[PDB]
PDB file of C-alpha atoms in Angstrom:
ATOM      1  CA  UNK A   1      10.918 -12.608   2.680  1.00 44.35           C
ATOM      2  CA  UNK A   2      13.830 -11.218   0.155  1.00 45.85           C
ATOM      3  CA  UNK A   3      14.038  -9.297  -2.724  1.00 43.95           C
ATOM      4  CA  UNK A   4      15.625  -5.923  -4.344  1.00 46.10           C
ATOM      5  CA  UNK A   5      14.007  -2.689  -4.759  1.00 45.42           C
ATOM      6  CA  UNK A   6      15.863   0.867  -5.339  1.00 44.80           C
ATOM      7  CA  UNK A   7      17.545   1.812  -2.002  1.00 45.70           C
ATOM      8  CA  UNK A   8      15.700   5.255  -1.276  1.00 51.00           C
ATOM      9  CA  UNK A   9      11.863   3.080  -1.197  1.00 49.71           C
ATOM     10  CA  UNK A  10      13.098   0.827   2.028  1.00 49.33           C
ATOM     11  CA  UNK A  11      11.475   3.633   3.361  1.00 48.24           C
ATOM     12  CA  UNK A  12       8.398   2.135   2.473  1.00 50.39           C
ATOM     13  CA  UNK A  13       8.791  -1.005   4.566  1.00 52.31           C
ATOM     14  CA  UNK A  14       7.221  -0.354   7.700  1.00 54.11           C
ATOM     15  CA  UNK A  15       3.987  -1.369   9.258  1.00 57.02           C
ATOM     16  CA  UNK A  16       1.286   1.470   8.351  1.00 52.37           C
ATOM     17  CA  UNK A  17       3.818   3.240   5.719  1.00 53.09           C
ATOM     18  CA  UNK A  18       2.969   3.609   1.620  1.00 55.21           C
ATOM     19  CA  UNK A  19       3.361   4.449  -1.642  1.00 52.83           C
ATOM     20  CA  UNK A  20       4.591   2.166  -5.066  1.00 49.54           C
ATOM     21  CA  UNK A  21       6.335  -0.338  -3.409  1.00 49.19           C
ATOM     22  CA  UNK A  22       4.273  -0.825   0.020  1.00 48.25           C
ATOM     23  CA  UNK A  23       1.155  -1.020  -2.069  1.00 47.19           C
ATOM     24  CA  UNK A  24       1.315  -1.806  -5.509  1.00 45.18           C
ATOM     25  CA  UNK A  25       4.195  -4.274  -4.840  1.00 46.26           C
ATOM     26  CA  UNK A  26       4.752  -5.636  -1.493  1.00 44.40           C
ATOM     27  CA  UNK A  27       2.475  -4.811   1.891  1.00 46.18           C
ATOM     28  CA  UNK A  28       3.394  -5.582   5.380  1.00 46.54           C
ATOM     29  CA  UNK A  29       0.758  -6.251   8.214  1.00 50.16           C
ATOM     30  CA  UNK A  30       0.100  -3.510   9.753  1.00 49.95           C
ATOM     31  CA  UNK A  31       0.776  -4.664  13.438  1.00 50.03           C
ATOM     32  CA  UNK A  32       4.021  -6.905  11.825  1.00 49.09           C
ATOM     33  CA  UNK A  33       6.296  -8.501  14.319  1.00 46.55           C
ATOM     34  CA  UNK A  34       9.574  -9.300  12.864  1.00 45.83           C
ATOM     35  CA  UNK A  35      12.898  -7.408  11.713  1.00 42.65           C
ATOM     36  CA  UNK A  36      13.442  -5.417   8.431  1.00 45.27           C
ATOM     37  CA  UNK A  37      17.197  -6.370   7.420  1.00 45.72           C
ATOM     38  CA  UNK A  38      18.592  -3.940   4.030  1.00 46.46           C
ATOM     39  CA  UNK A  39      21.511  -2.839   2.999  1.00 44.89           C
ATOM     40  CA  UNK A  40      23.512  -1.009  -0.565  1.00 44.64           C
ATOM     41  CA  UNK A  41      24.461  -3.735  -2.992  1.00 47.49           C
ATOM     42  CA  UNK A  42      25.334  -1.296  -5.982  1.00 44.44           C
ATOM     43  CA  UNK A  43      28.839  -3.236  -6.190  1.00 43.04           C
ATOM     44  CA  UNK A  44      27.177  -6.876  -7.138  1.00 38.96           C
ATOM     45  CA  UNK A  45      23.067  -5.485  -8.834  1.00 39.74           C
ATOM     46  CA  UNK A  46      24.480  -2.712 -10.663  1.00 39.68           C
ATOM     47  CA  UNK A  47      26.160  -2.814 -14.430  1.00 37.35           C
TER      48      UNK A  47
ATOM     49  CA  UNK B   1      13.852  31.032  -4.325  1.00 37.85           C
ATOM     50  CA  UNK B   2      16.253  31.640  -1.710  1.00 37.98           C
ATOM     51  CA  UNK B   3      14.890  30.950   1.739  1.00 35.02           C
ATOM     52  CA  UNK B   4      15.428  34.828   3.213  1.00 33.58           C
ATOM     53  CA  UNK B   5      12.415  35.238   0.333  1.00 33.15           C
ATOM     54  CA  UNK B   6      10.956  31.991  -0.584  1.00 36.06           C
ATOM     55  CA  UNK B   7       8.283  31.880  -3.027  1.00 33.56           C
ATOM     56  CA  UNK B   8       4.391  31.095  -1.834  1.00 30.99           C
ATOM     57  CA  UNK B   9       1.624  30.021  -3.960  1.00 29.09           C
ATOM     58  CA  UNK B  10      -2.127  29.802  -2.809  1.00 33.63           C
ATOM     59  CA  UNK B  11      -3.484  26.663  -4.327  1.00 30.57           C
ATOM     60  CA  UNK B  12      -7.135  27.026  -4.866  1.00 27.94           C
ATOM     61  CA  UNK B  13     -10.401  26.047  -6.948  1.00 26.77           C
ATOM     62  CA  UNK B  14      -9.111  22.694  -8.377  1.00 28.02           C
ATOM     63  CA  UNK B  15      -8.724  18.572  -7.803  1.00 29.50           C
ATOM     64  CA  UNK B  16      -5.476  17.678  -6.569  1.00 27.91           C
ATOM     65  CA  UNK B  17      -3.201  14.120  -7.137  1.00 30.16           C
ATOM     66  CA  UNK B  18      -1.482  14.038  -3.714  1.00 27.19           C
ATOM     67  CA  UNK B  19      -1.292  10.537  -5.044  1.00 24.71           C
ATOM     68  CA  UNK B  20       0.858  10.921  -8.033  1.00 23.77           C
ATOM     69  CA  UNK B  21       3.410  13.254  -5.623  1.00 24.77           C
ATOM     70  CA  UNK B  22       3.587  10.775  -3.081  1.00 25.60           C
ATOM     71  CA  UNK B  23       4.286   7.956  -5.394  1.00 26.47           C
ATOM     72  CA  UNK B  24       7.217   9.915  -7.009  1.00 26.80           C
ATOM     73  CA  UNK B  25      10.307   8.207  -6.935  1.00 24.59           C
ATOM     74  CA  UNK B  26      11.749  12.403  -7.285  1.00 24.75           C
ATOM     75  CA  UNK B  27      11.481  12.482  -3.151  1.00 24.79           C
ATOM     76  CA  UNK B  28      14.428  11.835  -0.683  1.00 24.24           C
ATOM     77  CA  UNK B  29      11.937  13.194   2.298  1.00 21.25           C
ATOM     78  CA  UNK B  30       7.468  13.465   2.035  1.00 17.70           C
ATOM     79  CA  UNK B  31       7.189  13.828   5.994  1.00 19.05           C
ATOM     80  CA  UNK B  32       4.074  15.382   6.994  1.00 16.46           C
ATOM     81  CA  UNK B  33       2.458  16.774  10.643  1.00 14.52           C
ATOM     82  CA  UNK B  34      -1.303  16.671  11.671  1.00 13.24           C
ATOM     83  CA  UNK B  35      -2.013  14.612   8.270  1.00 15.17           C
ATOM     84  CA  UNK B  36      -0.615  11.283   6.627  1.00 12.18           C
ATOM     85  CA  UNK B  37      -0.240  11.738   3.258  1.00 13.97           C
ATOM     86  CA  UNK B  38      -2.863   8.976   2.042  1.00 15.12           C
ATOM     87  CA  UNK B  39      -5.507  10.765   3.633  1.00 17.22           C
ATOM     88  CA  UNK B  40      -4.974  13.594   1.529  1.00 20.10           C
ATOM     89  CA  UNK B  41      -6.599  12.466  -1.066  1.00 17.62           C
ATOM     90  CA  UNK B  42      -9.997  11.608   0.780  1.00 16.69           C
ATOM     91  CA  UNK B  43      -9.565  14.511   3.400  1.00 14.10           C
ATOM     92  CA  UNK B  44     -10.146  17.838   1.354  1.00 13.58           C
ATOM     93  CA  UNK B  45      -9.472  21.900   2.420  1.00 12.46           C
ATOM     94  CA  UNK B  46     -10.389  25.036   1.481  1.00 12.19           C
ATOM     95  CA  UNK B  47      -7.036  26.296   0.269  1.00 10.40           C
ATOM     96  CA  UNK B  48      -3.648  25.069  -0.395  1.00  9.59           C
ATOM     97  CA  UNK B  49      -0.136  27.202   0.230  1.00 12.37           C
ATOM     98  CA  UNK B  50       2.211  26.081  -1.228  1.00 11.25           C
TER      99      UNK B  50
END
């Protein structure tokens, strides 16, 4: 899965967490089995 | 305030939107202890300090 999203909500992806993003957006399973990968991009999304 | 004297407000007598807090994008931190802050608004007490 990839996509963007404001860097203070990756908070929101985890398994059992909340809020705009992990519910009116995207939701994870909530026993998910994989790896969560993010990282600042402000120098190439920003303008 | 300053934290020596911090200020304390009972919250009482009223509906609450622990939903509309928690989805504010204002937060860098929401933690909470003994309740998970979805629950809040289903859960309900009989006062509020804030």
């Amino acid at each position: 899965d990839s996509f963007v999203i404001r860097g203070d909500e990756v908070r929101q992806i985890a398994p059992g967490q909340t809020g705009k993003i992990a519910d009116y957006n995207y939701k994870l399973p909530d026993d998910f089995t994989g790896c969560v990968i993010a990282w600042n991009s402000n120098n190439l999304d920003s303008k | 305030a300053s934290v020596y004297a911090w200020n304390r407000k009972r919250i009482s007598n009223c509906v609450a939107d622990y939903s509309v807090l928690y989805n504010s994008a204002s937060f860098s931190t929401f933690k909470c202890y003994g309740v998970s802050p979805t629950k809040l608004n289903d859960l309900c007490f009989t006062n509020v300090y804030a």
